[model samples]
Target: MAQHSKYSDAQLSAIVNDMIAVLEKHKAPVDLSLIALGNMASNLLTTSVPQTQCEALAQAFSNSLINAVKTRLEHHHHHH
Candidate 1:
């Protein structure tokens, strides 16, 4: 499915990265932080973004965080 958005891809990526950084800096739990961040993203964007797309956007943001963690773990193990 194709989705349209008022924000650019770079803007979305930046937001997700910033969210992750804040969560990590505070040492939030990995398991719960993603969900919380997703909810936060959805709620914040709902007012500006289309209602139908909010969930998908939030999911994407959450998935990106998960993938980032997985990649970091993989890299750490490989280097160790």
Candidate 2:
């Protein structure tokens, strides 16, 4: 069977570990729901994300999420 990724096994392992750390730091549960969602998102973006804008897309997603979380935190802070 052909490999979908060109990364070595170690590289893939490191990527998974990095993603796990990110999710954990964000207080995202390491559950089936999150796994499923991440897998789905990964599958959807696998080709598209890397082919188009790569790092830019990642930065955009990160920035957007950061802004969203900050907004929520600020909203709760003001209300409570």
Candidate 3:
């Protein structure tokens, strides 16, 4: 099993949101690939967050993204 994260869900959400804002500010592509997002996120977090915590943050962000996409897919399936 994966280890529990030190940060709370709200904190993770805020961090993810901030990362998204950074991407937006940079005018990143709308269909940004995961690798590209990872690159952007890694660059952004490298300076702001400690290196030790960066992997956990990245995992949280990945989980959040997966959940968000799954939710959207479910919603779309229900509608259609």
Candidate 4:
């Protein structure tokens, strides 16, 4: 069976927007930080993972990238 990418553009956009909403709710600056991180992570993981585990790795990458983004945001927010 052919494997599909874990998340579509629309799904990514949704996740991004959700993160943005959280930032906005907290009066955090509206930045492209998460988007950039996600894109970079997606590209890197795509090149790194084996074809057989592409889908699973893709999802793992997405979750990991999101966690990374959120962690940074929290750190920055607390520092401010």
The clash tally of candidate 3 reads 0
Backbone Cα, N, C clashes tallied per candidate: 0, 0, 0, 0
> Could you give candidate 2's per-residue lDDT for residues 25-79 as a string of tens digits?
7765558657978898788677667775777887899899999999977886644
What local lDDT does model 2 show for residue 64? Answer: 100
Model 1 off-target regions past 4 Å?
1-43, 76-80
Better of 2 and 4 by lDDT: 2
RMSD of 1: 8.2
lDDT of each: 0.81, 0.80, 0.81, 0.78
Model 4 scores worst on lDDT over the 10 consecutive residues at: 28-37
Candidate 3 ranges with C-alpha deviation above 4 Å: 1-39, 76-80
> What lDDT tens digits, residue by residue, belong to model 1 across residues 9-77?
898999999977887788877768878867976678867776888778768978999999998778866
- Alpha-carbon RMSD of each model: 8.2, 13.2, 8.8, 13.1
What are the per-residue Cα lDDT tens digits for candidate 4 across 1-80? 67775879998999989887876777634356667667887787778878899888778967998999998778866447
- Rank the models by TM-score, top first: 2, 3, 1, 4
Task: Tell me which of candidates 2 and 4 scores higher on TM-score.
Answer: 2
lDDT of 1 at 4: 64
lDDT of 3 by residue, 31-78 (tens): 665779678777788788768988898789789999999987788664
Query: Which clashing pairs does model 3 show?
Result: none
